[PDB]
Each structure stands twice: as C-alpha cells, then as structure tokens.
C-alpha cells in the first residue's frame, strides 16, 4: 500500500485498502474509515464495483435526470466520492471550513456554504435527492465568485468548481457534449 493519504498526501495514522494500494487518514476518507471490517474496501473500490456490476451505468445520462434521483445507497456513495474528489485538490482548503465576510465594497452571501458543512449534511442523511447535494456544492463556488468580484482570488473558485464539475460528469456518467 501507499505510505501517504490519498486525499491530503501526508503520512500519519493511515488505514489501508484491502483491494487496492490506497491509504487514508480516518477522517480524510468519506465516509470516515469504518471501525472493524476485515477486509475493508475504500470508496474508490466500492465505486468501481458498482460500475462492474452494472456496466450500462456508464452510458451517458442527462444531468436533469441525475439531479432528480433519490439518495438511495448508491447515489449516497457517489455523492460521498464526488465530495472526496474535491477534498483531494489542495485548493479545497479555501472552501473547507466556515467562511466569514468583511471586505470593503462587498457584502457576504445570503446563504454561506462550505465543504465540511456538506460533509456533515451527507453524514446526517439530510439530502433526499442528488440535486440537494449538487446545489450546495455549486453554491460554495458561486458565493466565492460573487464576493471576490474582480480580485484575482476569484479564480480559486473557478478552479475548484472545475474539479467538482469534471468529477460530477465522470462519476454520474453525464452524456458527453461540445
């Protein structure tokens, strides 16, 4: 197995996947690495298994249909994985914890949002449809773009949104378009 966490790229107290060479800190993995369970399979392995069991699940889909899906176990897992893929980018640090807004010439958002809040919301089964999760994720970046206006720091929101969107299209097998 790897000797660094797949998500944050640091060593420490790591839990090793039994079915691939990846390793994780406890709370870097999503869901948090399960207490017992030998063997243990990581979220990358669990997603791969879904795909292998239903090869047709990789045919293209319409985003509108994906968003209306109820958060049954497989959709719950796909959203957990998509959230984890965002945390895998180091630029996710800017969006992880609760933000505050005090900048001359800007007003903070009506509905603040951040990655750890989405993480808790998933853990607590607060989303009933995929749409709920995707709306909160997109809100994170939209709030950032709006608040930072013309400051070049706005680009961090663009960059992390692009990682989110690319992974959304891959995980949920959204039909390719120009």
Which of 125, 127, 119, 118 is CA-nearest to residue 69?
A: 127
Nearer residue to Zn ion within complex by CB, 45 or 173: 45
Does 42 bind Zn ion (CB under 5 A)? Our answer is: yes
Instruction: Using alpha carbons, select from 144, 131, 161, 171 the residue that is nearest to residue 47.
Output: 171
> Which residue's CB is nearer to Zn ion, number 22 or number 144?
22
Asked whether position 43 contacts Zn ion by CB under 5 A, the answer is no
32 versus 135: smaller Cβ distance to Zn ion? 32
- Contact mark string toward Zn ion, 18..37, x via CB under 5 A: -xx-x--x--x---------
User: Distance (Å, rounded) from C-alpha 178 to C-alpha 161?
Assistant: 19
Identify residues 46-65 at the interface with Zn ion (CB under 5 A): 54
Smallest distance from the beta carbon of 31 to Zn ion, in angstroms? 14
Give whole-number Cα distances, 145 to 8, 120, 148, 156, 166, in Å: 25, 24, 6, 9, 19
Residues 45-73 as b/e (b if ≥16 CB within 10 A, e otherwise) read: ebbeebeeeeeeeeeeeeeeebeeeebee
The reply to whether 139 sits near Zn ion by the rule CB under 5 A is no
Among 4, 16, 45, 96, binds Zn ion (CB under 5 A): 45
Under the binding rule (CB under 5 A), the answer on residue 93 touching Zn ion is no
**Residue located via tokens 């995980």:** 171
Which spans in 97-153 are helix H? 115-123, 130-148
State in angstroms the smallest separation of the CB of 20 from Zn ion: 3
The footprint of Zn ion (CB under 5 A) covers 5, 7-8, 17, 19-20, 22, 25, 28, 42, 44-45, 54
């Amino acid at each position: 197995n790897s000797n660094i966490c797949e998500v944050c790229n640091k060593w420490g107290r790591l839990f090793c996947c039994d079915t691939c060479p990846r390793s994780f800190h406890e709370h870097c993995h999503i869901p948090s690495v399960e207490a017992n369970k030998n063997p243990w399979s990581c979220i990358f392995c669990r997603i791969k298994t879904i795909q292998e069991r239903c090869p047709e699940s990789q045919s293209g889909h319409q985003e509108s249909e994906v968003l209306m899906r109820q958060m049954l176990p497989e959709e719950q897992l796909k959203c957990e994985f998509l959230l984890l893929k965002v945390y895998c980018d180091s630029k996710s640090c800017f969006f992880a914890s609760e933000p505050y807004y005090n900048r001359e010439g800007s007003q903070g958002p009506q509905k603040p949002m951040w990655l750890n809040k989405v993480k808790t919301s998933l853990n607590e089964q607060m989303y009933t449809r995929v749409e709920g999760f995707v709306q909160d994720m997109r809100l994170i970046f939209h709030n950032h773009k709006e608040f930072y206006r013309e400051d070049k720091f706005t680009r961090l929101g663009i960059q992390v949104q692009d990682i989110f969107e690319k992974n959304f299209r891959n995980i949920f097998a959204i039909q390719e378009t120009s």
